[PDB]
UniProtKB/Swiss-Prot annotation, chain A:
Membrane-crossing residue ranges in chain numbering: none
Stated family: Belongs to the universal ribosomal protein uL13 family.
Name under which the protein is recorded: Large ribosomal subunit protein uL13
GO cellular component: cytoplasm; cytosol; cytosolic large ribosomal subunit; ribosome
GO biological process, one term: cytoplasmic translation
Originating species: Escherichia coli (strain K12)
Molecular-function annotations in GO: large ribosomal subunit rRNA binding; mRNA 5'-UTR binding; mRNA binding; structural constituent of ribosome; zinc ion binding
Record's subunit section: Part of the 50S ribosomal subunit.
Keywords associated with the record: Ribonucleoprotein, Ribosomal protein
CDD domains: Ribosomal_L13
InterPro entries: Ribosomal_uL13, Ribosomal_uL13_bac-type, Ribosomal_uL13_CS, Ribosomal_uL13_sf
Pfam families reported for this sequence: Ribosomal_L13
Swiss-Prot record, chain B:
Signal sequence bounds: none
Outcome following mutation: residue 93 to S/T/V: Abolishes translation elongation arrest of SecM
Organism: Escherichia coli (strain K12)
Keywords of the record: Antibiotic resistance, Ribonucleoprotein, Ribosomal protein, RNA-binding, rRNA-binding
Protein name (record): Large ribosomal subunit protein uL22
Keyword Protein transport: no
From Swiss-Prot, chain C:
Protein species of origin: Escherichia coli (strain K12)
Effect noted on mutating residue 80 to I: Does not regulate the S10 operon; assembles into ribosomes in vivo
Residues of the full protein shown: 52 to 201 of 201
The protein, known as: Large ribosomal subunit protein uL4
Annotated effect of mutating residue 83 to P: Does not regulate the S10 operon in vivo
BP terms from Gene Ontology: cytoplasmic translation; DNA-templated transcription termination; negative regulation of cytoplasmic translation; negative regulation of DNA-templated transcription; negative regulation of translation; response to antibiotic; ribosome assembly; transcriptional attenuation
Record region (Disordered): 1-20
Taxonomic lineage: Bacteria, Pseudomonadati, Pseudomonadota, Gammaproteobacteria, Enterobacterales
Note: The erythromycin sensitive allele is dominant over the resistant allele.
UniProtKB/Swiss-Prot annotation, chain F:
GO biological process, one term: cytoplasmic translation
Originating gene: rplT
Keyword Transport set for record: no
The name this protein goes by in its record: Large ribosomal subunit protein bL20
UniProt keyword list: Ribonucleoprotein, Ribosomal protein, RNA-binding, rRNA-binding
Protein family: Belongs to the bacterial ribosomal protein bL20 family.
Origin species: Escherichia coli (strain K12)
Length: 141, 109, 150, 55, 102, 115
RNA sequence: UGUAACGGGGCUAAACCAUGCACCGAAGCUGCGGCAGCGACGCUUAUGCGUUGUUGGGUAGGGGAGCGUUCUGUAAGCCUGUGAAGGUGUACUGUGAGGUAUGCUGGAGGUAUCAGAAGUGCGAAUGCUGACAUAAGUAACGAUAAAGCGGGUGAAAAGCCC
RNA sequence: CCCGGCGAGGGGAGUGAAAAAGAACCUGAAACCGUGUACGUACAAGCAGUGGGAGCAUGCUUAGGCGUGUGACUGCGUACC
């Protein structure tokens, strides 16, 4: 009889912090993507952005198993005549440590306007300090 | 009052005359009469003559007063096209269309 | 159809659907694929079936009480006014006055009357006996029809 | 040369979006007579900058 | 106040008072129905089930209407195999007003 | 007896163009294009009455699985827990209870914990 | 042409070998309605059904039962200026072809029922005629012998007259 | 009568039952081209629909909501012959 769907205006969004120091990249990124999407909430609706705002501080200290620190490569094309650029997991952290969690979450989120909308929710950081003290972002594990 | 005036079978296509008619829309008659003096087009003279009709049309018959009058509904409709033969190279013929427009103006207040 | 057999344009070469005649039924102003011819729609009826149908319909009038059998039925002079007046007493309007001895006086006087028809006892029909709301048969006409149908 | 399949009302419109021509909205006024004209142009009667300079 | 019950081979989370459309019943237009198929009754204290159905719970309801639903069209169409089919359908329902969550 | 067919054809085209009302461009305006859209709409409609039943089950299951994990049990163990306690309540309602009455819902997760 | 040999993210367990209960998962099976085809059933009866099984994907193709259109008989009847056909909307209704009622337009024909006869239903045939789109306000305005200014008439003059 | 070039073309006024019956003249469909009102639409990928579905605009009965137009976002989805 017309089951419940989460109305955007009525969605009460929450703020969280996750310290990614010594965490496994994928196992962090998954649990982030589950939250960002709003799966954990009992009022989950696939067409509405029900998930929570997360702050992922200490992104550079994220851990990876095996030889993936050197062996794991992040390819991307420049959209140019023969422009394929690669960067290993070390080299990626040497330049842009935010990109590692970003890319690891983005692949796990859905693809489309809402998928891009629920990415915006995430807030990755290299340093331990975060300037979102205004929201009282509570600790998550 | 509304007080219509219209040029039917006006020798110009809609698309061209309709370009002028978008300048004057919801504008005061005195301001609208000026624009078409300094709009560098044929259809300006063609559209003006209908408006300048519509104002006299309005003032003599029904409404009176020139100050409070606005061009409420100007619109151009495509009229009957006259078919003509244009002979091309290699023997073949093309049927060109001498297009006409129905220009209406409505001058209300 | 009037028109030449000529191909207006040739088989190939021009970018246009292969035509062979101006008169072809898929073209305008010429053809009608399966044109009608003047034909005879009349169909055979077996004598025994025709007689059997008459015997069937003429017997059903007796059950429905349409068949008004009478003695001598004839107008005085060849005049419609009298015939129209005499059916008022008989309480009839749409009728088939069947008569053995077909009177010209009665005939002429029922030509202008629409709902009345005056057939001869020999000239009864299947459609007529069904069509009219009553059927007035003369005692001689019943005797003739009896012998005719048998 | 030649379109593969016909464009729409929509596209035709999208292209025509820039075809709309602008009005003047910038009429001058002659000092002495008070007649309207284009900037840096003479009037219908024959004035420019409040002085007669034409027959 | 709200209770749960099985009717047209399917269950309805219903409250006391509101109308409920459910699948057609062999009942008159304005008689009454008793559902002893009650699965759950919620209040200050919830009476949930460790067996099939409750125990002494009975949902009493009154039949409101006996109409038909909206016309659902059915279009079957096999591309390029010279086959298509058309079939309308209106499903029969029975509106019931709840008048006793015991 | 020649039969003109202008009255009836129009009525046939106009019927379909009424069903095509709302479609983009020619698909609303032009019979020859509309008729395909109206059929396709029917095919998709026929299909999606099947998928509506699928989607909603997933939607419920996700809600129940979400609401269960707040109380510390997974959907797979929860449903087995309910089955083993001979609970006949469906996903549709469990999902509705999960959203609305959580204090009620909590009792079902305990009822499941027994088994 | 670009990672490009897990579908991707990603994983030392989210891989593999073995066992063990879970759960998800299709139009499959069960639940509750609704319709129809054939077979039994009691023998009801000349067929409704307490029924009662069972079936019901479908190209070529074969067999059933219908809708609608113009015309002929029922009809010199019936409906119609207190508004026909047609056009255009809206609301019901049938399993479908459809049907009914009515708003506006229209301004005079229409036709129940049961029969009869067909120029009886169109999206395709590089179909045939008329109308209108697209490209597009695009190319082009037909010799690279050349125009300039003054006055004239005229609503208006690069082109006409001087 | 009035605007216009004592044009076209219109607005009146009048005739008629009616002039969106005014001679380009009964009816006046569709393609096609417009003017105004409601909603949507300038970080978003594909047969353009379809199941879900917020909001907003109007119709209603109202002290629930149910029609109607619209369709953010989202699962599935490669036209017909
Ligand atoms: Mg290089
Ligand atoms: Mg997907
Ligand atoms: Mg001219
Ligand atoms: Mg514009
Ligand atoms: Mg022009
Ligand atoms: Mg035209
Ligand atoms: Mg040439
Ligand atoms: Mg040639
Ligand atoms: Mg000839
Ligand atoms: Mg020959
Ligand atoms: Mg020859
Ligand atoms: Mg060709
Ligand atoms: Mg001819
Ligand atoms: Mg002929
Ligand atoms: Mg023919
Ligand atoms: Mg014959
Ligand atoms: Mg024959
Ligand atoms: Mg014969
Ligand atoms: Mg013979
Ligand atoms: Mg009669
Ligand atoms: Mg004879
Ligand atoms: Mg091609
Ligand atoms: Mg093509
Ligand atoms: Mg448009
Ligand atoms: Mg342009
Ligand atoms: Mg301005
Ligand atoms: Mg039963
Ligand atoms: Mg085939
Ligand atoms: Mg059909
Ligand atoms: Mg005829
Ligand atoms: Mg036709
Ligand atoms: Mg039509
Ligand atoms: Mg009609
Ligand atoms: Mg058709
Ligand atoms: Mg239509
Ligand atoms: Mg819509
Ligand atoms: Mg839409
Ligand atoms: Mg259309
Ligand atoms: Mg349309
Ligand atoms: Mg289900
Ligand atoms: Mg390559
Ligand atoms: Mg390479
Ligand atoms: Mg690959
Ligand atoms: Mg790969
Ligand atoms: Mg390769
Ligand atoms: Mg390799
Ligand atoms: Mg290789
Ligand atoms: Mg895989
Ligand atoms: Mg896998
Ligand atoms: Mg281990
Ligand atoms: Mg294996
Ligand atoms: Mg098992
Ligand atoms: Mg299923
Ligand atoms: Mg099933
Ligand atoms: Mg089945
Ligand atoms: Mg049967
Ligand atoms: Mg069996
Ligand atoms: Mg089957
Ligand atoms: Mg079959
Ligand atoms: Mg074959
Ligand atoms: Mg029948
Ligand atoms: Mg028929
Ligand atoms: Mg009929
Ligand atoms: Mg008819
Ligand atoms: Mg007839
Ligand atoms: Mg006749
Ligand atoms: Mg009769
Ligand atoms: Mg008479
Ligand atoms: Mg009668
Ligand atoms: Mg009557
Ligand atoms: Mg009468
Ligand atoms: Mg009368
Ligand atoms: Mg009248
Ligand atoms: Mg009246
Ligand atoms: Mg009336
Ligand atoms: Mg009236
Ligand atoms: Mg009627
Ligand atoms: Mg007729
Ligand atoms: Mg009719
Ligand atoms: Mg009609
Ligand atoms: Mg009516
Ligand atoms: Mg009424
Ligand atoms: Mg009527
Ligand atoms: Mg009106
Ligand atoms: Mg009218
Ligand atoms: Mg009239
Ligand atoms: Mg008349
Ligand atoms: Mg009238
Ligand atoms: Mg007549
Ligand atoms: Mg008849
Ligand atoms: Mg027949
Ligand atoms: Mg018939
Ligand atoms: Mg026949
Ligand atoms: Mg025959
Ligand atoms: Mg034919
Ligand atoms: Mg065809
Ligand atoms: Mg068709
Ligand atoms: Mg075909
Ligand atoms: Mg064709
Ligand atoms: Mg071609
Ligand atoms: Mg053609
Ligand atoms: Mg064009
Ligand atoms: Mg130009
Ligand atoms: Mg140009
Ligand atoms: Mg171009
Ligand atoms: Mg160019
Ligand atoms: Mg050029
Ligand atoms: Mg040149
Ligand atoms: Mg030249
Ligand atoms: Mg040259
Ligand atoms: Mg001189
Ligand atoms: Mg001069
Ligand atoms: Mg001089
Ligand atoms: Mg001079
Ligand atoms: Mg002069
Ligand atoms: Mg002059
Ligand atoms: Mg002048
Ligand atoms: Mg002058
Ligand atoms: Mg003069
Ligand atoms: Mg001058
Ligand atoms: Mg000169
Ligand atoms: Mg020159
Ligand atoms: Mg020159
Ligand atoms: Mg010269
Ligand atoms: Mg010369
Ligand atoms: Mg001279
Ligand atoms: Mg000269
Ligand atoms: Mg004057
Ligand atoms: Mg002149
Ligand atoms: Mg003069
Ligand atoms: Mg004068
Ligand atoms: Mg005129
Ligand atoms: Mg005149
Ligand atoms: Mg006039
Ligand atoms: Mg008058
Ligand atoms: Mg009068
Ligand atoms: Mg009068
Ligand atoms: Mg009237
Ligand atoms: Mg009128
Ligand atoms: Mg009048
Ligand atoms: Mg009038
Ligand atoms: Mg009047
Ligand atoms: Mg009219
Ligand atoms: Mg009329
Ligand atoms: Mg007039
Ligand atoms: Mg005239
Ligand atoms: Mg003329
Ligand atoms: Mg004419
Ligand atoms: Mg015309
Ligand atoms: Mg007439
Ligand atoms: Mg009309
Ligand atoms: Mg018209
Ligand atoms: Mg007309
Ligand atoms: Mg109309
Ligand atoms: Mg139209
Ligand atoms: Mg239409
Ligand atoms: Mg259009
Ligand atoms: Mg437009
Ligand atoms: Mg429009
Ligand atoms: Mg517009
Ligand atoms: Mg807007
Ligand atoms: Mg972006
Ligand atoms: Mg946007
Ligand atoms: Mg695109
Ligand atoms: Mg994509
Ligand atoms: Mg895609
Ligand atoms: Mg839809
Ligand atoms: Mg929907
Ligand atoms: Mg609202
Ligand atoms: Mg989507
Ligand atoms: Mg897919
Ligand atoms: Mg698709
Ligand atoms: Mg496909």
């Amino acid at each position: 009889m017309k089951t419940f769907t989460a109305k955007p205006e009525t969605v009460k969004r929450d703020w969280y912090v996750v310290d990614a120091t010594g965490k496994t990249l994928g196992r962090l990124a998954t649990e982030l993507a589950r939250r960002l999407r709003g799966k954990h909430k009992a009022e989950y609706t696939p067409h509405v952005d029900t998930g929570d705002y997360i702050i992922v501080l200490n992104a550079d200290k994220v851990a990876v198993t095996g030889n993936k620190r050197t062996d794991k490569v992040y390819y991307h094309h420049t959209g140019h005549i023969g422009g394929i650029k690669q960067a290993t997991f070390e080299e990626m952290i040497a330049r842009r440590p935010e990109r590692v969690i970003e890319i690891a979450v983005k692949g796990m989120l859905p693809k489309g306007p809402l998928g891009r909308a629920m990415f915006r929710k995430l807030k990755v950081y290299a340093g331990n300090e975060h300037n979102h003290a205004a929201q009282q972002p509570q600790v998550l594990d | 009052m509304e007080t219509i005036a219209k040029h039917r079978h006006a020798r110009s296509s809609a698309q061209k005359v309709r370009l002028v008619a978008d300048l004057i829309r919801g504008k005061k008659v005195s301001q609208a009469l000026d624009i078409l003096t300094y709009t560098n087009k044929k259809a300006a003279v063609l559209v003006k003559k209908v408006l300048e009709s519509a104002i006299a049309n309005a003032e003599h018959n029904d409404g009176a007063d020139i100050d409070d009058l606005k061009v409420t509904k100007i619109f151009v409709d495509e009229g009957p096209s006259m078919k003509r033969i244009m002979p091309r190279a290699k023997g073949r013929a093309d049927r060109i269309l001498k297009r006409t427009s129905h220009i209406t103006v409505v001058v209300s207040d | 159809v009037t028109g030449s057999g000529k191909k207006p344009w040739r088989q190939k070469g021009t970018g246009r659907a292969r035509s062979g005649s101006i008169k072809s039924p898929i073209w305008r102003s010429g053809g009608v694929t399966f044109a009608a011819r003047p034909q005879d729609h009349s169909q055979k009826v077996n004598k025994k079936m025709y007689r059997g149908a008459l015997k069937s319909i003429l017997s059903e009038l007796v059950r429905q009480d349409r068949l008004i059998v009478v003695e001598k039925f004839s107008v005085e002079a060849p005049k419609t006014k009298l015939l129209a007046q005499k059916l008022k007493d008989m309480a009839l309007e749409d009728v088939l006055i069947i008569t053995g001895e077909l009177d010209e006086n009665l005939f002429l006087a029922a030509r202008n009357l629409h709902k009345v028809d005056v057939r001869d006892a020999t000239g009864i029909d299947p459609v007529s006996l069904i069509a009219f709301d009553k059927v007035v048969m003369t005692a001689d006409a019943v005797k003739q029809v009896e012998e005719m149908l048998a | 040369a030649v379109q593969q399949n016909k464009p729409t009302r929509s596209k035709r419109g999208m292209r025509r979006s820039h075809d709309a021509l602008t009005a003047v909205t910038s009429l001058s006024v002659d000092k002495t007579s008070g007649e309207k004209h284009l900037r840096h142009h003479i009037t219908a009667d024959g004035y420019y900058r409040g002085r007669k300079v034409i027959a | 106040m709200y209770a749960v019950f099985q009717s047209g081979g399917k269950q309805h989370r219903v409250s006391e008072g509101q109308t409920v459309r459910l699948e057609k019943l062999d009942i008159a237009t304005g008689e009454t129905v008793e559902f002893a198929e009650v699965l759950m009754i919620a209040n200050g204290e919830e009476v949930k089930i460790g067996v099939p159905f409750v125990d002494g719970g009975v949902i009493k309801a009154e039949v409101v209407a006996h109409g038909r639903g909206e016309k659902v069209k059915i279009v079957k169409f096999r591309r390029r195999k010279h086959y298509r089919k058309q079939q309308g359908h209106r499903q029969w329902f029975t509106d019931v007003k709840i008048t006793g969550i015991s | 007896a020649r039969v003109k067919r202008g009255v009836i054809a129009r009525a046939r085209h106009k019927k379909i163009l009424k069903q095509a009302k709302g479609y983009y461009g020619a698909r609303s305006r032009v019979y020859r294009v509309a008729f395909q859209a109206v059929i396709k709409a029917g095919q998709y409609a026929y299909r999606d009455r099947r998928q509506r039943k699928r989607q909603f089950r997933q939607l419920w299951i996700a809600r129940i699985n979400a609401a269960a994990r707040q109380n510390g049990i997974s959907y797979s163990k929860f449903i087995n827990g309910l089955k083993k306690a001979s609970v006949e309540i469906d996903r549709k309602i469990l999902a509705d209870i999960a959203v609305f009455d959580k204090v009620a819902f909590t009792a079902l997760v305990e009822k499941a914990k027994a088994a």
